[PDB]
């Protein structure tokens, strides 16, 4: 099951999220990405930020080498980190990600976030006062450098992540625009369903890709512990009993039926294999309306520090 992107390429509508906290050994990304491919996942989501592209690339090469899959069957996504927004850094950043993953191309390269940070070796450059150091970059020049990555064939498609409507319009109205973003990867789930942003993206032929669609990893560092737990929600549990499914599968199916490509992270073999059952059932129109009613503008990403960035999207 794929959606056609506005540049003609195809994207599988169910994707495997690979980010795990640094508590988790790097070897685990290799094992679970292999399990995801074996379970039926063909869309694999990574990023420079995740510090796992070598292991994710090893898992793809492993399933190609053993005969399970051809490179053409895999949709591999990586992302440009915010310290590399300056145009001269974009292509070397992609080529470095390609070198780590040991691939000739990525199916999708994204601007990970509109909030530019100080260039350097640190993912989170921090000044003498403990504050993250912002950078000011014309994101239209970042996009122009992204377009040349597609030109050269290092990325089959290019898109963005964590952009709001204002930010998307900035790229769409850029003079001399060569490629529109094929997608906007944003936090999206029943508590924060982005119905207006999704409507805007549909109007522009841009796919909305939902992360944290299962309610996030509730990382102790960011997520508020008193924030509601999505997978324990009463309405999702009622529908899970009605359909003889699980709350996670109801959340995933919800996005598929509203036209949203959905990611799903799991490092647990049984839950990885369970998640591809999203294709085995259908929610009713009344089911969808009940899930729509859960919307409460709750984002699991919470940061006092970035809330002051000029490009903060919320
Ligand atoms: N562009 C961005 O800024 C951005 C931001 C965040 C995430 N992402 C990407 O989106 C992917 C997913 O987002 P996320 O990190 O917030 O995780 P998620 O997809 O929302 O899942 C959250 C938790 O749900 C659990 N889970 C998975 N399947 C389950 C099932 N069938 N039943 C019960 N629980 C289940 C998982 O725990 P277990 O591992 O124990 O199964 C997982 O930790 C990430 O890996 C990343 O690739 C992108
Ligand atoms: C600004 O975020 C970071 C800056 C430095 C280091 C890390 C991060 N962000 C994350 O590790 C993260 C983790 C879980 C969910 C969501 C997360 O980020 C969401 C996001 C938004 C909103 N805008 O950009 C991003 C990225």
Coordinates of N, CA and C in Angstrom, one line a residue, residues 69-283:
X69 N 14.6 -9.1 -0.1 CA 14.1 -7.8 -0.6 C 15.2 -7.2 -1.5
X70 N 14.7 -6.5 -2.5 CA 15.6 -5.7 -3.3 C 15.6 -4.2 -2.8
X71 N 16.7 -3.5 -3.1 CA 16.8 -2.1 -2.7 C 15.6 -1.3 -3.1
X72 N 15.1 -1.7 -4.3 CA 13.9 -1.0 -4.9 C 12.7 -1.2 -4.1
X73 N 12.6 -2.3 -3.2 CA 11.5 -2.5 -2.4 C 11.5 -1.8 -1.1
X74 N 12.6 -1.1 -0.7 CA 12.7 -0.4 0.6 C 12.6 1.1 0.3
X75 N 11.8 1.8 1.2 CA 11.8 3.2 1.2 C 12.5 3.7 2.5
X76 N 13.7 4.2 2.3 CA 14.6 4.6 3.4 C 14.6 6.1 3.5
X77 N 14.3 6.6 4.7 CA 14.2 8.1 5.0 C 15.4 8.4 5.9
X78 N 16.1 9.5 5.6 CA 17.0 10.1 6.5 C 16.6 11.6 6.6
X79 N 17.3 12.3 7.5 CA 16.9 13.7 7.8 C 18.2 14.5 8.0
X80 N 18.2 15.8 7.5 CA 19.2 16.7 7.7 C 19.1 17.4 9.1
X81 N 20.1 17.3 10.0 CA 19.9 17.9 11.3 C 20.1 19.4 11.3
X82 N 19.6 20.0 12.3 CA 19.4 21.5 12.4 C 20.8 22.2 12.4
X83 N 21.9 21.5 12.8 CA 23.2 22.2 12.7 C 23.8 22.3 11.3
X84 N 23.1 21.7 10.3 CA 23.5 21.7 9.0 C 22.6 22.4 8.0
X85 N 21.9 23.4 8.5 CA 20.9 24.1 7.7 C 21.6 25.0 6.7
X86 N 22.8 25.5 6.9 CA 23.5 26.4 6.0 C 23.8 25.7 4.7
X87 N 23.5 26.3 3.6 CA 23.4 25.6 2.3 C 24.7 24.8 2.0
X88 N 25.9 25.3 2.3 CA 27.1 24.6 1.9 C 27.3 23.3 2.7
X89 N 26.5 23.1 3.8 CA 26.6 21.9 4.7 C 25.6 20.8 4.3
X90 N 24.6 21.1 3.5 CA 23.5 20.2 3.3 C 24.0 18.9 2.5
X91 N 24.7 19.1 1.4 CA 25.1 18.0 0.6 C 26.1 17.1 1.3
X92 N 27.2 17.7 1.9 CA 28.1 16.8 2.7 C 27.4 16.1 3.8
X93 N 26.4 16.7 4.4 CA 25.6 16.0 5.4 C 24.9 14.8 4.9
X94 N 24.3 14.9 3.7 CA 23.6 13.8 3.0 C 24.6 12.7 2.7
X95 N 25.7 13.1 2.0 CA 26.7 12.1 1.6 C 27.3 11.4 2.8
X96 N 27.4 12.1 4.0 CA 27.9 11.4 5.2 C 26.9 10.4 5.7
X97 N 25.6 10.8 5.7 CA 24.6 9.8 6.0 C 24.6 8.6 5.1
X98 N 24.7 8.9 3.8 CA 24.8 7.8 2.8 C 26.0 6.9 3.1
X99 N 27.1 7.5 3.5 CA 28.3 6.7 3.8 C 28.1 5.8 5.0
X100 N 27.5 6.4 6.0 CA 27.3 5.6 7.2 C 26.3 4.4 7.0
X101 N 25.2 4.7 6.2 CA 24.2 3.7 6.0 C 24.7 2.7 4.9
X102 N 25.7 3.0 4.1 CA 26.2 2.2 3.0 C 25.1 2.0 1.9
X103 N 24.5 3.2 1.5 CA 23.6 3.2 0.4 C 24.0 4.2 -0.6
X104 N 23.6 4.0 -1.9 CA 23.9 5.0 -2.9 C 22.9 6.2 -2.9
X105 N 21.7 6.0 -2.3 CA 20.7 7.0 -2.3 C 19.8 6.8 -1.1
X106 N 19.1 7.8 -0.7 CA 17.9 7.7 0.2 C 16.7 8.0 -0.6
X107 N 15.6 7.2 -0.3 CA 14.3 7.5 -0.9 C 13.8 8.8 -0.5
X108 N 14.1 9.3 0.6 CA 13.6 10.6 1.2 C 14.6 11.3 2.1
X109 N 14.9 12.5 1.8 CA 15.7 13.4 2.7 C 14.9 14.5 3.2
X110 N 14.8 14.7 4.5 CA 14.0 15.8 5.1 C 14.8 16.8 5.8
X111 N 14.4 18.0 5.8 CA 14.8 19.0 6.8 C 14.1 18.6 8.1
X112 N 14.9 18.2 9.1 CA 14.4 17.6 10.3 C 13.5 18.6 11.1
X113 N 13.9 19.9 11.1 CA 13.2 20.9 11.9 C 13.5 22.3 11.3
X114 N 12.6 23.2 11.5 CA 12.9 24.6 11.0 C 13.7 25.4 11.9
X115 N 14.0 24.9 13.1 CA 14.7 25.7 14.2 C 16.2 25.5 14.0
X116 N 16.9 26.4 13.3 CA 18.3 26.2 13.0 C 19.1 26.4 14.3
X117 N 20.2 25.6 14.3 CA 21.1 25.6 15.5 C 22.5 25.9 15.0
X118 N 23.4 26.3 15.9 CA 24.8 26.6 15.6 C 25.5 25.5 14.9
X119 N 26.2 25.7 13.8 CA 26.9 24.7 13.1 C 28.1 24.2 14.0
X120 N 28.4 22.9 13.9 CA 29.5 22.3 14.6 C 29.3 20.8 14.8
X121 N 30.1 20.3 15.7 CA 30.1 18.8 15.9 C 29.0 18.4 16.8
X122 N 28.5 19.2 17.7 CA 27.5 18.9 18.7 C 26.1 18.9 18.1
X123 N 25.3 17.9 18.4 CA 23.9 18.0 18.0 C 23.1 19.1 18.6
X124 N 23.4 19.4 19.9 CA 22.8 20.4 20.7 C 23.8 21.4 21.2
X125 N 24.3 22.3 20.4 CA 25.3 23.2 20.9 C 24.8 24.1 22.0
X126 N 25.6 24.2 23.1 CA 25.1 24.8 24.3 C 26.2 25.8 24.7
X127 N 25.7 27.0 25.1 CA 26.7 28.1 25.4 C 27.1 28.0 26.9
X128 N 27.9 29.0 27.3 CA 28.5 29.0 28.6 C 27.4 29.1 29.7
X129 N 26.2 29.6 29.3 CA 25.1 29.7 30.3 C 24.1 28.6 30.3
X130 N 24.5 27.5 29.6 CA 23.6 26.3 29.5 C 22.5 26.4 28.5
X131 N 22.5 27.4 27.7 CA 21.4 27.6 26.7 C 21.8 27.1 25.3
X132 N 20.9 26.5 24.6 CA 21.1 26.0 23.3 C 21.3 27.2 22.4
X133 N 22.3 27.1 21.5 CA 22.7 28.3 20.6 C 22.0 28.2 19.3
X134 N 21.1 29.2 19.1 CA 20.3 29.2 17.8 C 21.2 29.8 16.7
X135 N 20.8 29.4 15.5 CA 21.3 30.0 14.3 C 20.2 30.6 13.4
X136 N 20.5 31.6 12.6 CA 19.6 32.3 11.7 C 19.9 31.9 10.3
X137 N 19.1 31.1 9.6 CA 19.3 30.7 8.3 C 18.0 30.9 7.5
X138 N 18.2 31.4 6.3 CA 17.1 31.5 5.3 C 16.8 30.1 4.9
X139 N 15.6 29.5 5.3 CA 15.3 28.1 5.0 C 15.0 27.9 3.5
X140 N 14.8 29.0 2.8 CA 14.7 28.9 1.3 C 16.0 28.5 0.7
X141 N 17.1 28.9 1.3 CA 18.4 28.6 0.8 C 18.8 27.1 1.2
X142 N 18.3 26.7 2.4 CA 18.5 25.3 2.7 C 17.7 24.4 1.8
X143 N 16.5 24.8 1.4 CA 15.7 24.1 0.4 C 16.4 24.0 -0.9
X144 N 17.0 25.1 -1.4 CA 17.7 25.1 -2.7 C 18.8 24.1 -2.7
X145 N 19.5 24.0 -1.6 CA 20.5 23.0 -1.4 C 19.9 21.6 -1.4
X146 N 18.8 21.4 -0.7 CA 18.1 20.1 -0.8 C 17.7 19.7 -2.2
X147 N 17.2 20.7 -3.0 CA 16.8 20.4 -4.3 C 18.0 19.9 -5.2
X148 N 19.2 20.4 -4.9 CA 20.3 19.9 -5.7 C 20.7 18.5 -5.3
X149 N 20.3 18.1 -4.1 CA 20.5 16.7 -3.7 C 19.6 15.8 -4.5
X150 N 18.3 16.2 -4.8 CA 17.5 15.5 -5.6 C 18.0 15.5 -7.1
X151 N 18.4 16.7 -7.5 CA 19.0 16.8 -8.9 C 20.1 15.8 -9.1
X152 N 21.0 15.6 -8.1 CA 22.1 14.7 -8.3 C 21.7 13.2 -8.1
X153 N 20.5 13.0 -7.7 CA 20.0 11.6 -7.5 C 20.4 11.0 -6.1
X154 N 21.0 11.8 -5.2 CA 21.3 11.3 -3.9 C 20.1 11.1 -3.0
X155 N 19.0 11.8 -3.3 CA 17.7 11.6 -2.7 C 16.6 11.6 -3.8
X156 N 15.9 10.5 -3.8 CA 14.8 10.4 -4.8 C 13.7 11.4 -4.5
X157 N 13.4 11.7 -3.3 CA 12.4 12.7 -2.9 C 13.0 13.6 -1.8
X158 N 12.5 14.8 -1.7 CA 12.8 15.7 -0.6 C 11.6 16.3 0.1
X159 N 11.6 16.5 1.4 CA 10.5 17.0 2.1 C 11.0 17.7 3.3
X160 N 10.0 18.0 4.2 CA 10.3 18.8 5.4 C 9.7 18.0 6.6
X161 N 10.0 18.5 7.8 CA 9.5 18.0 9.1 C 9.4 19.1 10.1
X162 N 8.2 19.0 10.9 CA 7.9 20.0 11.9 C 7.7 21.4 11.4
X163 N 7.3 21.5 10.2 CA 6.9 22.8 9.6 C 5.5 23.1 9.9
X164 N 5.2 24.4 10.1 CA 3.8 24.9 10.2 C 3.4 25.4 8.8
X165 N 2.1 25.9 8.8 CA 1.6 26.4 7.5 C 2.4 27.6 7.0
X166 N 2.8 28.6 7.9 CA 3.6 29.7 7.5 C 4.9 29.2 6.9
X167 N 5.5 28.3 7.5 CA 6.8 27.7 7.1 C 6.7 27.0 5.7
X168 N 5.7 26.2 5.5 CA 5.4 25.5 4.3 C 5.2 26.5 3.1
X169 N 4.4 27.6 3.4 CA 4.1 28.7 2.4 C 5.4 29.4 2.0
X170 N 6.3 29.6 2.9 CA 7.6 30.2 2.6 C 8.4 29.3 1.5
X171 N 8.3 28.0 1.6 CA 9.0 27.2 0.6 C 8.1 27.2 -0.7
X172 N 6.8 27.0 -0.5 CA 6.0 26.9 -1.7 C 5.9 28.1 -2.6
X173 N 6.1 29.3 -1.9 CA 6.1 30.6 -2.7 C 7.5 31.1 -3.0
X174 N 8.5 30.3 -2.8 CA 9.9 30.7 -3.1 C 10.0 30.9 -4.6
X175 N 10.6 32.0 -5.1 CA 10.8 32.2 -6.5 C 11.8 31.2 -7.1
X176 N 11.4 30.6 -8.2 CA 12.3 29.6 -8.9 C 12.2 28.2 -8.2
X177 N 11.1 28.0 -7.5 CA 11.0 26.7 -6.8 C 11.0 25.5 -7.8
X178 N 11.9 24.6 -7.6 CA 12.1 23.4 -8.5 C 11.3 22.2 -8.0
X179 N 11.3 21.9 -6.8 CA 10.5 20.8 -6.2 C 9.7 21.2 -5.0
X180 N 8.5 20.9 -5.0 CA 7.7 21.1 -3.7 C 8.1 20.0 -2.7
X181 N 8.0 20.3 -1.4 CA 8.1 19.2 -0.5 C 7.1 18.1 -0.7
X182 N 7.6 16.8 -0.8 CA 6.6 15.7 -1.0 C 5.9 15.4 0.3
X183 N 6.4 15.9 1.5 CA 5.7 15.5 2.7 C 6.2 16.5 3.8
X184 N 5.4 16.5 4.9 CA 5.7 17.2 6.1 C 5.5 16.3 7.3
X185 N 6.6 15.8 7.8 CA 6.5 14.8 8.9 C 6.3 15.6 10.2
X186 N 5.2 15.4 10.9 CA 4.8 16.2 12.0 C 4.3 15.2 13.1
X187 N 4.3 15.7 14.4 CA 3.6 15.0 15.4 C 2.1 15.0 15.2
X188 N 1.5 13.8 15.1 CA 0.1 13.7 14.8 C -0.5 12.4 15.4
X189 N -1.5 12.6 16.2 CA -2.2 11.5 16.9 C -3.6 11.9 17.4
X190 N -4.4 11.1 17.9 CA -5.8 11.5 18.3 C -5.8 12.7 19.3
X191 N -4.8 12.9 20.1 CA -4.8 14.0 21.0 C -4.4 15.3 20.3
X192 N -3.7 15.2 19.1 CA -3.2 16.3 18.4 C -3.2 15.9 16.9
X193 N -4.3 16.1 16.2 CA -4.6 15.4 15.0 C -4.3 16.3 13.7
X194 N -4.0 17.6 13.9 CA -3.5 18.4 12.8 C -4.5 18.5 11.7
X195 N -5.8 18.5 12.0 CA -6.8 18.5 10.9 C -6.7 19.6 10.0
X196 N -6.3 20.8 10.5 CA -6.2 22.0 9.6 C -4.9 21.9 8.8
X197 N -3.8 21.5 9.4 CA -2.6 21.4 8.7 C -2.7 20.3 7.7
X198 N -3.3 19.2 8.0 CA -3.5 18.1 7.1 C -4.4 18.6 5.9
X199 N -5.4 19.4 6.1 CA -6.2 19.9 5.1 C -5.4 20.8 4.2
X200 N -4.5 21.6 4.7 CA -3.6 22.5 3.9 C -2.7 21.7 3.1
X201 N -2.1 20.6 3.7 CA -1.1 19.8 3.0 C -1.8 19.0 1.8
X202 N -3.1 18.6 2.0 CA -3.8 18.0 0.9 C -4.1 18.9 -0.2
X203 N -4.4 20.2 0.1 CA -4.6 21.2 -0.9 C -3.4 21.5 -1.7
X204 N -2.2 21.1 -1.2 CA -0.9 21.4 -1.9 C -0.2 20.2 -2.4
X205 N -0.9 19.0 -2.4 CA -0.3 17.8 -2.9 C 0.9 17.4 -2.0
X206 N 0.8 17.7 -0.7 CA 1.9 17.3 0.2 C 1.3 16.3 1.2
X207 N 2.1 15.2 1.4 CA 1.7 14.1 2.3 C 2.0 14.5 3.7
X208 N 1.1 14.3 4.6 CA 1.3 14.4 6.0 C 1.8 13.1 6.6
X209 N 3.0 13.0 7.2 CA 3.5 11.8 7.8 C 3.5 12.0 9.3
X210 N 2.8 11.1 10.0 CA 2.6 11.3 11.5 C 3.7 10.5 12.2
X211 N 4.4 11.2 13.1 CA 5.2 10.6 14.1 C 4.5 10.8 15.5
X212 N 5.0 10.0 16.5 CA 4.4 9.9 17.8 C 2.9 9.5 17.7
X213 N 2.6 8.8 16.6 CA 1.2 8.4 16.4 C 0.7 7.4 17.4
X214 N 1.6 6.8 18.2 CA 1.2 5.9 19.3 C 1.3 6.6 20.6
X215 N 1.4 7.9 20.7 CA 1.4 8.7 21.9 C 2.8 9.0 22.4
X216 N 3.8 8.7 21.6 CA 5.3 9.0 21.8 C 5.9 7.9 22.8
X217 N 7.2 8.0 23.0 CA 8.0 7.1 23.9 C 7.9 7.7 25.3
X218 N 7.3 8.8 25.5 CA 7.1 9.5 26.8 C 8.5 9.5 27.5
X219 N 9.5 10.0 26.7 CA 10.9 10.1 27.2 C 10.8 11.0 28.5
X220 N 11.5 10.5 29.5 CA 11.5 11.2 30.9 C 12.1 12.6 30.7
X221 N 13.0 12.8 29.9 CA 13.6 14.2 29.6 C 12.6 15.2 29.1
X222 N 11.7 14.8 28.1 CA 10.8 15.9 27.5 C 9.4 15.7 28.1
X223 N 8.8 14.5 27.7 CA 7.3 14.3 28.0 C 7.0 14.5 29.4
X224 N 5.9 15.3 29.7 CA 5.4 15.5 31.0 C 4.9 14.1 31.5
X225 N 5.2 13.6 32.7 CA 4.7 12.3 33.2 C 3.2 12.4 33.4
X226 N 2.6 13.5 33.7 CA 1.2 13.7 33.9 C 0.5 13.9 32.6
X227 N 1.2 14.0 31.5 CA 0.5 14.1 30.2 C -0.3 12.8 30.0
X228 N -1.5 12.8 29.3 CA -2.3 11.6 29.1 C -1.5 10.6 28.3
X229 N -1.8 9.3 28.6 CA -1.2 8.2 27.9 C -2.2 7.8 26.8
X230 N -1.7 8.0 25.5 CA -2.6 7.8 24.4 C -3.1 6.4 24.3
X231 N -2.3 5.4 24.5 CA -2.7 4.0 24.3 C -3.5 3.4 25.4
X232 N -3.7 4.2 26.5 CA -4.6 3.8 27.6 C -5.9 4.6 27.5
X233 N -6.2 5.2 26.4 CA -7.3 6.1 26.3 C -8.6 5.2 26.2
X234 N -9.7 5.6 26.9 CA -10.9 4.8 27.0 C -11.5 4.5 25.6
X235 N -11.6 5.5 24.8 CA -12.2 5.4 23.5 C -11.5 4.5 22.6
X236 N -10.1 4.6 22.5 CA -9.3 3.7 21.7 C -9.4 2.2 22.2
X237 N -9.6 2.1 23.6 CA -9.7 0.7 24.1 C -11.1 0.2 23.8
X238 N -12.1 1.0 23.8 CA -13.5 0.5 23.4 C -13.5 0.0 22.0
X239 N -12.9 0.8 21.1 CA -12.8 0.4 19.7 C -11.9 -0.9 19.5
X240 N -10.9 -1.0 20.3 CA -10.0 -2.2 20.2 C -10.8 -3.4 20.6
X241 N -11.6 -3.3 21.6 CA -12.5 -4.5 22.0 C -13.5 -4.7 20.9
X242 N -14.1 -3.7 20.4 CA -15.1 -3.8 19.3 C -14.6 -4.6 18.1
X243 N -13.4 -4.3 17.7 CA -12.8 -4.8 16.5 C -11.9 -6.0 16.8
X244 N -11.7 -6.4 18.0 CA -10.8 -7.5 18.4 C -9.4 -7.1 17.9
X245 N -8.9 -5.9 18.3 CA -7.6 -5.4 17.9 C -7.0 -4.7 19.1
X246 N -6.0 -4.0 19.0 CA -5.3 -3.3 20.1 C -5.4 -1.8 19.9
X247 N -5.3 -1.0 21.0 CA -5.3 0.4 20.9 C -4.3 1.0 19.9
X248 N -3.1 0.5 19.9 CA -2.1 0.9 18.9 C -2.6 0.7 17.5
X249 N -3.2 -0.4 17.2 CA -3.7 -0.6 15.8 C -4.9 0.3 15.5
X250 N -5.7 0.7 16.5 CA -6.8 1.6 16.2 C -6.2 3.0 15.9
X251 N -5.1 3.4 16.6 CA -4.5 4.7 16.4 C -3.9 4.7 15.0
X252 N -3.2 3.6 14.6 CA -2.6 3.6 13.3 C -3.6 3.6 12.2
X253 N -4.6 2.7 12.3 CA -5.7 2.7 11.3 C -6.4 4.0 11.1
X254 N -6.5 4.7 12.2 CA -7.1 6.1 12.2 C -6.4 7.0 11.2
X255 N -5.1 7.0 11.3 CA -4.3 7.9 10.4 C -4.5 7.4 8.9
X256 N -4.4 6.1 8.7 CA -4.5 5.6 7.3 C -5.8 6.0 6.6
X257 N -6.9 5.9 7.4 CA -8.2 6.2 6.8 C -8.5 7.7 6.6
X258 N -7.7 8.6 7.2 CA -7.8 10.0 7.0 C -6.7 10.5 6.0
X259 N -6.0 9.5 5.3 CA -5.0 9.9 4.3 C -3.7 10.3 4.8
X260 N -3.3 9.9 6.1 CA -2.1 10.2 6.7 C -1.2 9.0 6.6
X261 N 0.1 9.2 6.1 CA 1.1 8.2 6.3 C 1.6 8.2 7.7
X262 N 1.7 7.0 8.3 CA 1.9 6.8 9.7 C 3.1 6.0 10.0
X263 N 4.0 6.5 10.9 CA 5.1 5.8 11.4 C 4.7 5.1 12.7
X264 N 5.5 4.1 13.1 CA 5.3 3.3 14.3 C 6.6 2.8 14.8
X265 N 7.1 3.3 15.9 CA 8.3 2.8 16.5 C 8.0 1.7 17.5
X266 N 8.7 0.6 17.3 CA 8.7 -0.5 18.4 C 10.1 -1.2 18.3
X267 N 10.7 -1.5 19.4 CA 11.8 -2.3 19.5 C 11.5 -3.7 20.2
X268 N 10.2 -4.1 20.1 CA 9.7 -5.3 20.7 C 9.2 -6.2 19.5
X269 N 9.7 -7.4 19.4 CA 9.4 -8.2 18.2 C 7.9 -8.4 18.0
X270 N 7.2 -8.7 19.1 CA 5.8 -9.0 19.0 C 5.0 -7.8 18.6
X271 N 5.4 -6.6 19.1 CA 4.6 -5.4 18.8 C 5.0 -4.9 17.4
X272 N 6.2 -5.2 17.0 CA 6.6 -4.8 15.6 C 5.7 -5.6 14.6
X273 N 5.6 -6.9 14.8 CA 4.8 -7.8 13.9 C 3.3 -7.5 14.1
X274 N 2.9 -7.1 15.2 CA 1.4 -6.8 15.4 C 1.1 -5.6 14.6
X275 N 2.0 -4.6 14.5 CA 1.6 -3.3 13.9 C 1.3 -3.4 12.4
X276 N 1.8 -4.4 11.7 CA 1.5 -4.5 10.3 C 0.1 -5.1 10.1
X277 N -0.6 -5.5 11.2 CA -2.0 -5.9 11.1 C -2.9 -4.7 10.9
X278 N -2.4 -3.5 10.8 CA -3.2 -2.3 10.5 C -4.0 -2.5 9.2
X279 N -3.5 -3.2 8.3 CA -4.1 -3.4 7.0 C -5.3 -4.4 7.0
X280 N -5.5 -5.1 8.1 CA -6.4 -6.3 8.2 C -7.8 -5.9 8.6
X281 N -8.1 -4.6 8.9 CA -9.4 -4.2 9.4 C -9.6 -2.8 9.0
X282 N -10.9 -2.4 9.2 CA -11.4 -1.0 8.8 C -12.2 -0.4 9.9
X283 N -12.1 0.9 10.1 CA -12.9 1.6 11.1 C -14.1 2.2 10.4

